[PDB]
Every structure is written in structure tokens, then in C-alpha cells.
Amino acid sequence: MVLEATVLVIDNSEYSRNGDFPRTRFEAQIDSVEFIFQAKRNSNPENTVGLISGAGANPRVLSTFTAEFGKILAGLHDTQIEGKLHMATALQIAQLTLKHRQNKVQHQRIVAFVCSPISDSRDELIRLAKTLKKNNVAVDIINFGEIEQNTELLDEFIAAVNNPQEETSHLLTVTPGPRLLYENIASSPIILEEGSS
Amino acid sequence: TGRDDTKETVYISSIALLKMLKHGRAGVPMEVMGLMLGEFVDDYTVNVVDVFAMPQSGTGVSVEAVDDVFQAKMMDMLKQTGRDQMVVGWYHSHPGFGCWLSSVDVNTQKSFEQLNSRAVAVVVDPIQSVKGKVVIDAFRLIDTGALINNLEPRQTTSNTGLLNKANIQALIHGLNRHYYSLNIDYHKTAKETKMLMNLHKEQWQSGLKMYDYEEKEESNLAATKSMVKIAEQYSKRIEEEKELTEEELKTRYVGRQDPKKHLSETADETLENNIVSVLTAGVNSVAIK
Amino acid sequence: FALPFEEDEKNSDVWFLDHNYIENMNEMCKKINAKEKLIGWYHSGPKLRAS
């Protein structure tokens, strides 16, 4: 792919531990965070990824942009397993992280695993929508948590963010069955995806 | 030529003067070093904004002590915060010598000229300064080929210049060889100055506190009793003052060990103190109550 | 030494901090002088907050 800066967002809600993916969803996530980091690098090696949590009851910046998985690993193992995803804070935090980098000629991406339905205000969601369009930030959300009993509030906004543009923003929906979580992300486009230009 | 050539007046900001001294004083008696961030404007005006030190991987002032990775890593960091600007020299310390570069440090300066055309080498004296003011001088090294064919005088004109003779003769030879030296000036912001002038914050509380009054009474007794004992000598002193000449008096009758000096001073001390004591206490009762 | 710091005050739960920068810088300073440890961080005012 192209030289890309990504914030990977990990949800540590209390639906992030559902038995849906073996063995537990939380162990499934350890394998996926590692898997995804790697997929991005092998595509084009000029990729970097930072790490922030969107949950724990608090969001926390673990890691800024790095080409070493050892830091990203280290931020992951320090977690507190209960939280609640604050959708709004993750988008903002991610956007500020993307303004400062070691390379400032890179694509601006946010990928977020969403393991719970959102409890966020409706008004709040509308503001971030145009914040992503101002700064020309495109976001793929991997959802397998907000389809379990919830309907996608997020859909409209993610659509809106897309423009003709080498990045395409996408809502990626994953059937939440047993086949393991890194595998469904792999069989979803996320480095098999095409542009909007 | 590309320019008429003259040696830089260095306007070293407050933070950079103060920082080089902290690092280099700590580093006694080792050679210490680091790089200068600044901007070059005019025909001689170098403003040095900050300094940052170069971690010792050698003895200091070596090319084993200048690491490529380190240089790279520091620059990469300074961009995030906007402190990235171009290198206008490098500092070092001799704390065993005045401002005068040694042979090894010329060799370091010869490598810097390749890096930057206007790079200075600034000698910071951490303990060895010979005036009340800090002695620091900046040098630049240009080739022997211009200097010998007599282009050195042209370069040194249309400026006030600086002449020093701190190591006398040794300096002159070195000075000649390198290039020149020029007045060093200091850039002060009036924000910077005000922070520095205030040094206390519980000064307001303290001026309306006092000690226990038991030790005040004690100082007053000690003062009066001590002045009796030098008053006895003081009478004996003015028996003399019978020997012509001020100097002869001091040598012969030991006119220097003066009773006069020790009375005046001790009377002054206890006196000034008791003015303040009454002032503080008398304010305290009526103001507070 | 400076860090980059961005404050968003719409939500006081939205903050920018360069994590990696801190660890890197801590190690370099120790090689000049070992008595330098992380003992805190300054906030630039211009007042105290609850934040």
C-alpha cells in the first residue's frame, strides 16, 4: 500500500470478553492487534502505528507512532479489562495524535475495533463527523460488537467522510461466529480494498 | 569573493549562556561539549537561541564523542516542539585554560567548518573567568591561504573587535592562526529578566515574622559587653599616633589590627538591627489587632 | 525539556501526549549526568484548574 500513519484503537469494555470468539474475545484481540500491525507493515514497510485505548473507563495514550511492535505489545499487556467504550473521545484523541508525527507526509487513518454498542450522545457524533472531513482523516471501523443488538449510528458519518481520495473510508461488518477474529478482518478488505478516486 | 568577511558579533540569549555554564561547571575538569541552535542574519549577527549537550561517548571534544545517531535523534525530536533551526556552532569547555583553543580542539573546529560555514567554537570558562563578568569568547577558523597573503586585516575592519591577552603570547599565535574575536553581547527579554529578579515568594510573610525574643536580648548584651573590651584597646591606640607617615604607623605599631574598625562595625550591626526590631514589633501589635 | 502538548477542553478526557518522546529523552540525559530523573512535569498556567 502507501506510506500510512494509523491509530489502532482497542476496546476494553465488558463486552470485550464475550465468548463468541475463542477462547475469550480478549485473547482473540491479542492475536488480532499483533496480526493487523504486521499486515500493514508487510504491505509497504513505511507504515507506522500508534496505540491508544478508547476504554478502561478512561482513555489512555500508550504509544505514539513507532515501527516496532515491541512497544505496541508493551502498551497492550498493561490494560484494565473493564471499561466502556467512549466513541467520541477516541476519535478526537486519535486526530491530535495524527497532527504530530515523525513523518508528516503520510495518510491519516484510524482503525477502531468496536466490541460494544455505543452509549454516546447523538449530538456528539455529528460534531466529529465534520471534524474528520476538515482534517482529511479516513476511518475504517471493524464492527462485530455494535451489530449484536444495536443499529449503526456511525454509518452516515463514515459515508460522509469519503470523498474521491486515494483512501476510502468504509464500515466493515464482521459475522461474529467462530472462525477467529484475525481471520474475519483478513477476509474483510482492509489491505485488499481499492480507492474512491 | 562571496562576502567581504568579518567575524560575528554573538548575541547569546539568556537561556543559552546560563545553560552552557551549568553543564560545563558540572563537567570540571573534563572537556564538555554540545551544539548551538540559532540563526544567521546580517553580515555578522548570530543569535544563539538554545544549546543542547552532546552525550559523552568519548572523553569530550573528540569525534568519538560526536555520534551520528545522537545528532540525528535530537534533531528529530526538536521538530515536534519547533526548536529545530540550523546549527550555528558548537560549544566546549576548557576549565584548565583561558579562551584559547588547544590543538585537539582545532582539529574538532576543522571538522565543524565542513558542516557549517559560519560555525563558531565557544570556549566557556566555568571557574577560570578573570573579571566579575563571565569570560567567554567565540572563534572561527578560516584557511591559512587567505590569512598569509594578508587578507586578515580587511576581514577585521568595520567593527569594534575584541582583543584579549588572557594567556598573553600563546593566545596571540592562536588568535592569529584561527581568525579573530569579536564582542559578545547578551539578549535579554524583559519577561526573562523579571523572573530572574524575584527569587522568593514567602518574602511577604517573612518580613512580618520574627525570631524568639530571648536570643534578641542575648545579641544586645553580647554587643554592648564586646564593645567595652575593644574600647579598652581603643584608649591605648590614641596614646600613640605619634609616628610620622600613615604606613610607618601601620607597620611599626600594628595600626592594622585596628580597634577603631571593629568598634564602628559592631556598633553599626547591633544598631541597625534594633531599628528594625522596634519597627517590626510595633507594626505587628497595632496592624494585626 | 519541552514536550509537545495539545489541550482540547471540549472534553477534558481528550488529550495529547507524546509517550515515546519521553522514554527516549530520559535515556540520553542520563549519559551526560546520572542525577537527572523524571520528578514531574510543568504546566504552563496561567492558572490552576480542576483538570
Place this chain on the structure above:
Amino acid sequence: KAQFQELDSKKQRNNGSKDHGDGILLIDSEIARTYLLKNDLVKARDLLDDLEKTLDKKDSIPLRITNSFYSTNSQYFKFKNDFNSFYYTSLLYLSTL
């Protein structure tokens, strides 16, 4: 109490890295409260000392955990008939309730 001492070996790798003394603290309180409903003042008495020190070892104890610790203290004091001691435990119990 015995299971929780084995469990923590396993459990650490699953969570990511977490504490596991949480269950243990609550179990020791329940042993003291069983003793007190059976009138053994002393067995509960050495359990308070050992339990108090472990609160202080952490920077903080949770509200759930500390209610159970203050639960045991209230029970013990009203048997001894110290009004003064009983009073301090109750005002805290309402705060952290």
C-alpha cells in the same frame, strides 16, 4: 481461598496483567464474620491486623472491598461495648457504601 492462590498463575496471562489479591481480601473478611456470628472475638482479632496492613500496602482499596473490611469491624466492636469505636466505623460505612 486455596483456589485463588493457585488461580493467579494462570489468570495473569489471560487478562493481560492484572491483580488477583481482590478475591482473597474479601475471603478473609468472610472468615472473620463467620467467627463473630459464632462468638470468637480473638480469631477475628488477628484477622483484622493482617487485613488492615494489606489495605495500606496498596495506594487504594476499592469501595466494595473496603465495605466488607468495615463490615467485620462494626460487628466486633458492639460485642466489646465500646461506643466510641463503633461510631468511627459507621460514619465511614455510609461514605463508601
